[PDB]
Structure formats: C-alpha cells, structure tokens
C-alpha cells in the first residue's frame, strides 16, 4: 500500500483499477507525500461502496499511498468517499475526496483535495462539503484537468480520469 513516491506511475494505477473485476464502478488513487512530514491516517469515509484493502496508517516522507475502492454489488450507487491524513507537526489535515457515480446520465466523476487546520477525521459532513464546495472547502475538480493550487502553506497537484475505472494521481508538497 506504500511505495517510494518516485516509483508511482499512471500505469500502476491502471493495473490496480483494472484488476478489480465484477463491478462497473471502481477507482485507484495514488497519493504522493512529497514533504518531509509523516502523515497519519484519520480514517476513510465511504459515501458509496467499500474497499477491499486497508488504507495505509502512515505515509512517511517521499512515499506514495496506493489505495482502491469499488461500488457494492447489487446497488445503484458508485464508489464515493473521502480519506484524510493528519500532517504530524503542522496541526493540519489533508482530505482527498473521490466520486465515481453510478449514473452518468445524471452525474460525472469529481474529486477534491483540501488542506484544513486541526485534526479532522472524515465523515458525511466533511465529504458533502468537499463534494459541494461548501463549509470552507474549495470547489471540487473535474476530470481530465491538471489541477494546481495552494492551500495553507502547501502546494497541491493532481488529476482524475473520466470513467468508471477511474484513477486519481495527486501530490502534496510544501509551498
């Protein structure tokens, strides 16, 4: 679940997500910690679906997390959630939201990354605020776009693909 950040490739994420057979909505997320800080997982909140592997509790300096999630069998929902990492020594939390919906006639893929003050575990309120751009969260990000922004002394970069076997590649650096 943890590799050196410099070894992360889009091909690795493609392999991960394509290896989830049996459902039509799933995601692989590769998240690079390009800081010198240790990141501590505060949880994963699932709005829709689940995951078959535990998220890494610690992402150390210059490592990437590999994470995957998938929709549930027999349901008209997709894979949607938020994971969160506390930046040890900075008293801030980084949230990563993903949404790969069941119904592309109505909805599209979305993602978000936010840096907030304090130690903030993910939950339905945090997730909804990231999805809607409310409660002090930035507005979320469309797929097929390279996102670059700065928040609370950090630079955030990443992108998401557009379909039901989605990938997100995202990176945290000190600004």
Numbering used by the authors: 4 to 178
Paper text:
Recombinant bryoporin crystallized in the space group P22121 with one molecule in the asymmetric unit. In addition, 13 residues of the C-terminal linker, containing the affinity His6-tag introduced during the cloning, could not be traced in the electron density, likely due to flexibility. The overall structure of the monomeric bryoporin reveals a conserved actinoporin fold, thereby reflecting bryoporin’s high amino acid sequence similarity to actinoporins. Bryoporin is built of a compact β-sandwich composed of two parallel β-sheets of five and four β-strands, flanked by two α-helices. The structure of bryoporin harbors a patch of surface exposed hydrophobic amino acids in the L3 loop and α2-helix that are spatially close to each other and conserved in actinoporins, where they play a crucial role in membrane binding.
Based on the amino acid sequence, it was suggested that bryoporin was related to the actinoporin family of pore-forming proteins, originally discovered in sea anemones. Here, we provide detailed description of the 3D structure and mechanism of action of the moss cytolysin bryoporin, revealing its close kinship with actinoporins from evolutionarily distant organisms. Our results suggest that bryoporin could represent a part of the moss defense arsenal, acting as a pore-forming toxin against membranes of potential animal pathogens, parasites, or predators.
